[PDB]
């Protein structure tokens, strides 16, 4: 019926400092229907230990999930979130920017 | 911390190729999730998600499991019925959603109750605020409305929403008070980002707050400014707290004219940040 | 504490 494409934010739990353990988050929201694929990426490669929150929804019935993993940021490593949903032709990649 | 809510959120998604619907249920007090059920998990039990619900005894967990399983079978039947009402094919996946719960006011007494149902992500049927009458969005929902009026569903839900619901919310608030009745005011700061030789971005940050409701507003020379600003959606930190930021683009050198104003339940008066540093 | 266990079908 209505398909709503996901909004994506990618960010750390705590202010990022190199060498300090932290959590990398990918928050996906405003989507329908609920089936979604989300991976967290380190230098383009899929991270295995990622967890996610239990599915819930907003006032407008759209869904939201948080996907997250522990990580230790470094100066050179790049992180991103890759999302696929029925509203997307191709998976969408959002890079982590530590100031956002 | 002023008014409080208890809400339950249910999503059932059909699987036409094989088997029964995926059913997910989650329960919240305010912005804290405290229970889950997922039909694809191994336990087949309602499970705790907050430490202060773990002290509930096995009769509680057995009852909650029974209720949530029976709720799941009702949504299984509903997905079949609504497919019929809408003359849809048996080939596609469809979704039911239900949310219900209650609010108490700062007087600690019942404030409002709700029970809302959606099919494929649009309103289907909803109990009105009087808890006595129904809003049906279309002729399929009208049929449900007639069924539900004849079964006195409003009356049953009203008794729960005004009685049980409020009584248990109050119980949870006291058992979980160390966290549920603690407000975490936002930890704020501003950052500065040159965008060109002639302009800069100020970004106001609100971090580690609870509950999630917050207002960040920029002002220039004491007047609200929305042009040349950006505001992200409030987002979970993953430790139970929330984050947000707001940014404004300004002429380099004129940073001092701008102030960020932060409003939050944990702040007795709003905070004002200004780039001086 | 949820409502139930009698959830009336649509
Ligand atoms: Ca896709």
Numbering used by the authors:
A (entry chain B): 0 to 99
B (entry chain A): 0 to 276
C (entry chain C): 1 to 10
Publication text:
We demonstrated that the TCR from the 1E6 T cell clone bound to HLA-A*0201–ALWGPDPAAA using a limited footprint and very weak binding affinity. Here, we solved the structure of the 1E6 TCR with 7 altered peptide ligands (APLs) determined by our previously published combinatorial peptide library (CPL) screening, 2 of which mapped within human pathogens.
The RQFGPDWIVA sequence (present in C. asparagiforme) activated the 1E6 T cell with around 1 log–greater potency compared with ALWGPDPAAA. The range of Tm was between 49.4°C (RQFGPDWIVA) and 60.3°C (YQFGPDFPIA), with an average approximately 55°C, similar to our previous findings. Additional small movements in the Cα backbone of the peptide around peptide residue Asp6 were apparent in the A2-YLGGPDFPTI (KD = ~400 μM), A2-ALWGPDPAAA (KD = ~208 μM), and A2-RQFGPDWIVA (KD = 44.4 μM) structures. For instance, the A2-ALWGPDPAAA, A2-AQWGPDAAA, and A2-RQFGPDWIVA (KD = ~208 μM, KD = 61.9 μM, and KD = 44.4 μM, respectively) were all entropically unfavorable (TΔS° = –2.9 to –5.6 kcal/mol), indicating a net change from disorder to order. The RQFGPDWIVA peptide, which was substantially more potent than the preproinsulin peptide, is within the proteome of a common human pathogen (C. asparagiforme), demonstrating the potential for an encounter between a naive 1E6-like T cell and a foreign peptide with a more potent ligand that might then break self-tolerance.
